[model samples]
Target chain A: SSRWSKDYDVCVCHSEEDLVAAQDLVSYLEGAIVSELCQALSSSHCRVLLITPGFLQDPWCKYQMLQALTEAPGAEGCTIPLLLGLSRAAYPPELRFMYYVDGRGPDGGFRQVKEAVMRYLQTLS
Target chain B: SSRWSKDYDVCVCHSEEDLVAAQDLVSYLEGAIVSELCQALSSSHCRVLLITPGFLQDPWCKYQMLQALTEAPGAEGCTIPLLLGLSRAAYPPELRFMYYVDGRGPDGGFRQVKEAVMRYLQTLS
Candidate 1:
């Protein structure tokens, strides 16, 4: 119930327009805007990346993507990038180094995304 | 422009569900989620509150309310609370001390909210 408290296991970062699709991914994990993650990135919890075709176009979304890496250096696995609709080249050069899951096609990579989220949460717990 | 730069004059804070209503209010002003505002509250710019009936119910919105106040003490004027679709009672106990504009009715307090935003921007410039 406490707002500032670190209650989330991961923060799902994505463009607002992609929220509907991202919602499916976060349905099995605790997710939110990067701000919530940033507030607790250093403390605990994980950051999930729901990458869509228009992911990097928005300044705010890009900020969150980079913030996760910058704030949690050396813990690259802490931020998982779910590549959907976009190719690896579509991601920023910095994020290219991080591992990503194939989220294209009708399945939207739900199984892989869920497994990634669960694995990260397990590590954190 | 650099995304991290304080290029914005103000950040409009509102619930995601009320974004359409809020868009009309922030149509003339620089507005974003409280995350962006919190990132720059101490640096420069201002935070504008677009209060709706559901504003206080959301944990994230409430966090932003207190974050603005905690980060900018004595600068109570820094955050402008716009009462929209809800009474002053709908706001948190702490926000009750700040000045608010009646945003109920068809006008949605656009004139007052715009004027308030412009006034705050002027101070920053």
Candidate 2:
């Protein structure tokens, strides 16, 4: 199935700790987030990242990282990393190749994801 | 200092587990969250509550509740409770008097907050 016509708009795969990042992205998208990995990844397709300190330690988050790897993994991969409350060095070694947002400003972080949403959406449909 | 002119726009005062609620509120306000009970409460004044499941067990959150009571506490008091993944029954008994958002929809929750913010700000200024 092509991402051009998928079930979800986007999937914000995050750990329980950074649920804030997920909701904020959900609110900004004016839509939703994805649950149930295999189907979620297949349906929503592209994932947005919130790699906070909790992310790496959260077993579920790492599982999704590996799942994406098994999917369409890329150099500037099919994911958007919205880094919050941490630095680049701490970024997941796997997803680091993709572009990410800076932790400096609030709206800027929201805009970063929106931009990616449009940038990638244009590519899909 | 009267809340008419305080340090922060508003304080989110959330458990680390539900940082999502705080940042969503913060991003919506296009402003910030309160920190440090003494100075933060003393300055920014009105606090927004994100009474998620993690809240009840959080030592620091209980401290804020107790602190709010020592402050201006009210029936439809100053604080706005934006309940995330929990229910009214689970709400902190102390802060139950204030109004809150529902888990039903996304934008409605955000709307629930913006309205309370305006209602209270009108009184302060």
Candidate 3:
């Protein structure tokens, strides 16, 4: 798919339990993954993994993570992991290929999400 | 003051507006800054700057950042700057001497706070 034609600048992948935060993330991201996940990921320019203990519990989230990694094997910032109530040490090994935005801080950590999305989108132009 | 005798493992310095986040931080650190600030900083093993727009807007937060720099001079990781809804580029120059934990993510980003505190505290023994 054409990068310019992508539906979103960034798409967030998280657990069902994380909807409130995920919704908040949707508001933060400039635009908007998994097999059926790959197509979804391809529709977006980039992917944001909303990681938390609950995110890991959902196999679907992990599958989406795998799909995201495969989508950007070499493009470092293509998949951005946002750690929510999580630690770098505990970050899933599959998604460690790129640096992450730790969202465990106050202020909902949304500023970093917008910044990262804006940064990655800028590189395309 | 003796490091071993410090009352708190980490002390938080932020604007009054950031008190909720600051108080949340108190719960995260295993233990717990600024002249009237210097002595308070010396009383703790380390300092945590709750960096937010509100935090930067407050003069006292900036002053504490400077005093924290003076206190550590060379000891990296002695002061942890927590970016709450903030960006690294926006991070105060005075406190840029060390890395920061971006808390703008979700779950309050406190896990990193505890981990960094634990990591630095380990070096003391």
Candidate 4:
């Protein structure tokens, strides 16, 4: 990946399992840009939540994090990073110091997670 | 408009100026529900801003207000009602006491309105 390519493509697959598959299909078919995948991350009304064991494990996931931090309209306020059984160090360097919920920690109980999600959702509303 | 119709339609005209024309066309031809117009007021990610002298002056505008109040995911926090030149009394009964930006009052200067909008947008970020 020379220079990580200046023009990064956002690939929105049906599921995590299909990320590569969708990318291949889109590249080969040269289809019209899918409308459903054109979500604007930086829109003022947009909110994001990442629930995962290790978001930085995959290049695709890392790209998502980069896009969110770079393109999201209110990256600091709108993004919720949920670390499932992972330490803060596991996060990408850019997200290391950001506020996150430790899914493995005692305080990251179901109720707390629910409340956090609700609070974030309310802000979007 | 018997009973005001239990299931109201959401019409998203390109501009407020086109609302009446769009309604008439939709009513006459029974067009396929426009995808852009199917915005869900209750969606957790939806935010609303009403900038007008009197939003409730029209039945459709009133319907939007009702939907926002009753269905928005975070109704209390997500909605921003900007009164162009009206008083608190000009607002709908349900929204009278809610926090709003007075676009007409002394504090309703251009800078104040810009700040108020920015603050609300940050909450969603």
What's the TM-score of every candidate structure? 0.40, 0.41, 0.42, 0.28
lDDT of 3 by residue, B7-96 (tens): 556777777777777776776553331111223425667677777888665555554564455436255437777788776666544233
TM-score of the second chain, each candidate in turn, equals 0.70, 0.71, 0.75, 0.46
User: Candidate 3 versus the native: TM-score?
Assistant: 0.42
Off by over 4 Å in 2: A1-4, A31-42, A73-77, A93-96, A105-108, B1-125
Q: Could you tell me how far off, in angstroms, the CA of residue A13 lies in candidate 3 after the best superposition?
A: 0.9
In candidate 3, what are the lDDT values of residues A50-86, reduced to their tens digit? 7888876655665466445543625444777778887
Best by lDDT: 3
lDDT of 2 by residue, B1-125 (tens): 34546776566777877766667667777632333322342545567666677875665665454444434434334666666776665544323333456755567476667666666665664
Model 1 C-alpha lDDT per residue in residues B1-125, reported as the tens digit of each score: 22335555566777778777666655645444122332433443567776676765665675466545544435434667777766555443334344667766335676776676566555542
By TM-score, the better pick of 2 and 4 is 2
Q: How many collisions between residues are there in candidate 2? A: 2
Any residue pairs clashing in model 2, and if so which?
A20-B20, B11-B34
Better of 1 and 2 by DockQ: 1
Quote the lDDT for B48 in model 1: 71
lDDT of 1 at A75: 46
Q: Taking the tens digit of each residue's C-alpha lDDT, what string does model 1 give over A3-35?
A: 334455555776778877766665545344222
List each candidate's DockQ score: 0.02, 0.01, 0.01, 0.01
Q: Residue A101 CA error for candidate 2 (Å)?
A: 2.3
Residue A65 in candidate 4, Cα distance off native in Å: 42
